[PDB]
Design a protein around this ligand. Structure first.
Ligand SMILES: Nc1ncnc2c1ncn2[C@@H]1O[C@H](CN2CC#Cc3nc4c(N)ncnc4n3[C@@H]3O[C@H](CNC(=O)NCCCNC(=O)C2)[C@@H](O)[C@H]3O)[C@@H](O)[C@H]1O
Ligand SMILES: Nc1ncnc2c1ncn2[C@@H]1O[C@H](CN2CC#Cc3nc4c(N)ncnc4n3[C@@H]3O[C@H](CNC(=O)NCCCNC(=O)C2)[C@@H](O)[C@H]3O)[C@@H](O)[C@H]1O
Ligand SMILES: Nc1ncnc2c1ncn2[C@@H]1O[C@H](CN2CC#Cc3nc4c(N)ncnc4n3[C@@H]3O[C@H](CNC(=O)NCCCNC(=O)C2)[C@@H](O)[C@H]3O)[C@@H](O)[C@H]1O
Ligand SMILES: Nc1ncnc2c1ncn2[C@@H]1O[C@H](CN2CC#Cc3nc4c(N)ncnc4n3[C@@H]3O[C@H](CNC(=O)NCCCNC(=O)C2)[C@@H](O)[C@H]3O)[C@@H](O)[C@H]1O
Lengths: 261, 261, 261, 261
């Protein structure tokens, strides 16, 4: 297999990467960071998100693996001490692939840009008040006034979405979840309050009310967009694929990350 | 079609029912409350939940319709003024069927009882402290200490689940959602806090820790169970079917019920 | 000083109590559980709440001290290993007194009963729906529909109130805090949602709307009241007094109980 | 009395102001915007906050009055139709003064700046991750990681603080309330979660952990501070004073603004 390895870049991660490369040299494994079939991320979830975005144009051809060199990362399945066992198992093709859903964000102006999110896409104002109309499948649902909005994938539900009161969703559910950031609610201004969970093929559109400039973040890459006509969220047709070598169920992963491990 | 009509029993609902019966008499419609194919509920969501439980043994043979005689009911699609138009459309078979998921609860003792919920199943203590171990697909996930737990269907997400901070979920998603009621969280006792959303085929089991008596409510029918070994939640294979005569999208229904109408 | 010692009653607490009694015998200390001036509670916060209610008729004549024999108790200032140092310091009168506010609950029928709470007073229905009008200083404020209501003292804010989303309040603030349990909020039914913090001399009255039977709990002593006309909450004029031998600030106590220790 | 009138500046507010000025001309009232004793704000709460900050250096010499020309403003006690009755009552000195507490924020660098807030002071990062140590009366209480923090006065509790889950506090309570914005909570990172309510003379200090640049907002005036050593919050010794001409209790004001009016 062609493979590549990204590192967080501290001394620990860089040496783990060099040692795994040396270990891969003893098998029919070619290091190739243009067209890898296996992408190994060594670091944390931030490192793993950067790896996903480096290869977002070849998701259907890649299985990802995460090694956490600090504390547990949610997209990590290996500790550094297990890296040799990983090399051997990867080499012998001894794995099954697991797929998580992805979120597509489309930004239109006055022209379009699309982004793929593994965790979430959020939107805030570029300074002034944040006010958008929320339109669900072309039905006007609410006018949102507040700090911003967060649209999460299932595997993203344990990240920013969790901090905003959202529900944790198992990743086999093909859905996206919208959570509010500090909405205004009084007798004049009203939002639903609750997180909202949307299935595949529903489209959630945000439409400016006054200011048209927004800070849009996709997995914490945050970009100012000007003259925005619409921001459209839907579950992507594209999926990220994971190499899985043993059972590490999602709910155990949640348990280990939030309850005790 | 065989049909029947349940009424909340106030003067308004009883007369609407008699007038609809008279209207049905002018078509090939037989009143039959043993084996109806159409069940019409006139009242509110409580009335509609009672209708569902009166016929839970023939869900695959029945389409339900709700008329709200007070303010909007979530399971209601008609106002009383539209009852004549309903009679005519029902008679001419001018409808499509829509299915919502259901929740199955199994209670084992030391012997089993199962219940079907359209909104939710909740569990509390019979007086003493409520303490259960939460086991997800045979994996011990947390020990819950607090007031109780609520497992909601998708259409139930807008009911008790909403009041407990849960996410609102579109009913095409085959899932159930677990929410906490006032858990204890300190350095000794820890729960996940967040609502949890489970797909079809996941089993959530509650296991007593000390007290074995629980008050279990299914759609607000609340029953004391003694000597409980286990309470198991899963998405039912059974579905409730609705007669639909026009588009009334779920998110518009949410909008009309919580934002403005 | 006259003193007494209550024990949780496990082997550990009973022996600690006997050893402290023996230690007190070596000083001008008389064991007296009718008119103690010092009440020592050995156990947990439940034990300490029982001690407070055993002596609620002599609060102005008593300083309380808590020993936690299990993990940290919020009303506890001593570990069991420090009991000897406690005996010596108590005996030599080497302490300052600290006062926390208390909550008064009055229940009227059709006749009155009053209770004093150190943590909180809550109200629920005796089975049926819970619906009360909330009246603040004779001003109708909201009609509450839901599971119940919790009125907390400042030192109670870290207990049930915390689990219900309430704010943690420093105990020098003479106030009470009202929190909701799972209110219904839709276009027909509306509550404030937020916790409410009331100063001394404000009166919060709950008035039945339909059912007149309520389960009222004061520090987890829960009693059915029938034919209730009114439930009135106000900050008590009475205060619980603590013996303090060293600085153990409230916010450090919070830190140690919820963050790390 | 010397008085001045600020207007939101729309046609409606400017004409109300001119008509009130004309009405004041018929009494012993001098228009003076350098040293007014009465400051009348015509507009909304934003207008009223701007009036407060225009005169923050003479709070002990000023009574404020608010007129809301749009929907109810929380700092507003008059509708535009009552402006004549206001002029007459103000002129004849027919009023009592009411005082609300204020929040003092001190920012130190490496040099100090202080600000007075009527609603709240918030702190966020200037872009990068927000990470501060929270120190309460020189006791390290938690390391906060998340979007930011909000410190609210009592009258501010119904504003941003409310949107962040904070408790609503009656303004006679001399306190400040700290609320979190989307904190990270997992097995590695822990915050208290709950709002915290501090009495007079407690000092809450925020200390940078890595990045030293912060966006600090005081009543929605938002300013970048660089090279920050510390941000200190305490209840101000200074108070804003209101002219009151009739009873309009705080809890009725809350009721009218959030429940119905
Ligand atoms: N106010 C907020 N509250 C909560 N989360 C927030 C907030 N703002 C942004 N984010 C999330 O940061 C992601 C991106 N950063 C790497 C990551 C992750 C991750 N992904 C998952 C997952 N799928 N499941 C469970 N845990 C996960 N984690 C865990 O978050 C912790 C690290 N993140 C933070 O410090 N963020 C705060 C600002 C700084 N960020 C970064 O520079 C990049 C590590 O523990 C990591 O393991 C974004 O995508 C949001 O989601
Ligand atoms: N603390 C609580 N907070 C919030 N809900 C609670 C709480 N406790 C129990 N329940 C729910 O009551 C259901 C059952 N009652 C009929 C119904 C409904 C319904 N179903 C849906 C739906 N699927 N989507 C959107 N709205 C829905 N509604 C709307 O609730 C309002 C009526 N219910 C209440 O007064 N309950 C409080 C106790 C009294 N109950 C009853 O005697 C029977 C009407 O407005 C009705 O339209 C149970 O199943 C829970 O879910
Ligand atoms: N759903 C709920 N969620 C959260 N609390 C609830 C709930 N229902 C009731 N209560 C509280 O129980 C008190 C009374 N019980 C002894 C105590 C305490 C206490 N007082 C304080 C304080 N002032 N500050 C910080 N921690 C405190 N604790 C800590 O609570 C833990 C123990 N309590 C519970 O298991 N209760 C659940 C039901 C069983 N209870 C009891 O048999 C008696 C121990 O850790 C103890 O240290 C009542 O008064 C409420 O407040
Ligand atoms: N995410 C957020 N969620 C909730 N509040 C937020 C958020 N961010 C900032 N703020 C608050 O805005 C204040 C400042 N703006 C004028 C005011 C007020 C006020 N003060 C009180 C009070 N003491 N009690 C009850 N209601 C009050 N209101 C009511 O807020 C509504 C208007 N405010 C907003 O649109 N803000 C969002 C951004 C735009 N802002 C402004 O350009 C200036 C009107 O209804 C007004 O009446 C700041 O100081 C925060 O507190």
């Amino acid at each position: 297999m062609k493979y590549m390895i990204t590192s967080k870049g501290d001394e620990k991660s860089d040496l783990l990467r060099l040692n795994m490369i040396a270990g891969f040299g003893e098998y029919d494994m070619e290091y190739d960071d243009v067209e890898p079939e296996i992408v190994i991320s060594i670091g944390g979830d931030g490192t793993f998100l950067s790896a996903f975005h480096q290869y977002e144009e070849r998701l259907d051809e890649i299985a990802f693996i995460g090694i956490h060199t600090g504390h547990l990362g949610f997209y990590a399945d290996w500790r550094p001490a297990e890296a040799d066992k990983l090399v051997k198992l990867l080499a012998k093709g001894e794995y099954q692939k697991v797929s998580y859903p992805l979120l597509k964000t489309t930004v239109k102006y006055g022209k379009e840009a699309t982004y793929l999110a593994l965790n979430e896409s959020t939107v805030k104002s570029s300074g002034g008040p944040f006010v958008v109309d929320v339109v669900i499948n072309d039905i006007h649902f609410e006018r949102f006034r507040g700090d911003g909005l967060c649209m999460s994938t299932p595997s993203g539900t344990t990240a920013y979405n969790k901090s905003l009161g959202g529900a944790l969703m198992h990743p086999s559910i093909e859905a996206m979840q919208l959570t509010e950031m500090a909405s205004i609610n009084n007798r004049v201004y009203r939002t639903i309050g609750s997180p909202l969970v949307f299935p595949k093929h529903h489209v959630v559109s945000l439409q400016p009310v006054n200011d048209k400039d927004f800070q849009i973040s996709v997995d914490h890459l945050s970009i100012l967009h000007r003259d925005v006509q619409e921001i459209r969220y839907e579950v992507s047709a594209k999926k990220i694929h994971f190499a899985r070598f043993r059972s590490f169920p999602f709910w155990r992963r949640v348990h280990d990350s939030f309850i005790e491990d």
